């Protein structure tokens, strides 16, 4: 090995914790999506005509 | 047939908490058919010979010298027949207590 057993202790514990914070955060964000007027109203475009 | 009734389920005798674990008072540390592990510091002995924690803390197993109670005939006999240098050793379970016993707080300033 390059490092000994004790030389690698916690040698990256900062990155590991960070990663897990991102994993958590990604899941915490899950919520039903926003609903907008452009949808419910935009449906009416179905019957659009020439006159 | 000749052979009968050998059928009974295991008793799940084992060691429940292991060295270095955290424990809360009243946790069963081990359960055993005969004494295998003896209770040490802050570990209570049940009447079925199971060991439970009397204190919140950390479990530790240890080898230590065995000096039986003089009210026990058998054990004192076993001890009495040993060659003059020999000492019985056994395995013990302790709980090294964690929280401090209590704190002093400021109630009222008169």
């Amino acid at each position: 090995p390059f490092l000994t057993a004790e030389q690698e202790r916690g040698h990256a514990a900062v990155r590991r914790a960070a990663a897990f914070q991102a994993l958590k955060a990604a899941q915490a964000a899950r919520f039903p999506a926003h609903r907008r007027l452009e949808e419910q109203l935009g449906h009416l475009l179905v019957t659009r005509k020439w006159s | 047939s000749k052979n009968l009734g050998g059928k009974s389920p295991g008793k799940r005798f084992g060691i429940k908490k292991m060295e270095g674990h955290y424990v809360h008072a009243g946790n069963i540390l081990a359960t055993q058919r005969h004494f295998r592990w003896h209770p040490g510091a802050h570990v209570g002995l049940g009447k079925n010979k199971c060991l439970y924690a009397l204190e919140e803390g950390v479990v530790r197993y240890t080898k230590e010298v065995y000096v039986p109670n003089p009210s026990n005939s058998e054990a004192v006999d076993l001890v009495t027949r040993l060659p003059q240098g020999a000492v019985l050793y056994k395995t013990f379970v302790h709980v090294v207590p964690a929280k401090p016993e209590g704190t002093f707080k400021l109630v009222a300033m008169l």
Binding site: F2, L3, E6, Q7, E8, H11, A12, R15 | -
Partner: protein, 97 residues
Amino acid sequence: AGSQWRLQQGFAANPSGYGPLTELPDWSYADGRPAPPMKGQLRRKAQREKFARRVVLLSQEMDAGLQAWQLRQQEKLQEEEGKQKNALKSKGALLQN
């Protein structure tokens, strides 16, 4: 076949990998303007870069690790002396002699 030779010579075992055969932009406009880049080469760029970035990262982490250890050794050795400087002068046994 002939992957063994190709490896001894330091190329890719498969002619498809990373040679000038694959990497280069196989067509161009007659005028000489370059062609829009190729999807394959784009992806290969991105993941080669990803790889490189990672190499950098691990190298740096291992270095910073070793330095942290050396520092901790120094702090320990400094505390061993921080005990002696801060110590009281031994009196009792020496004064009679």
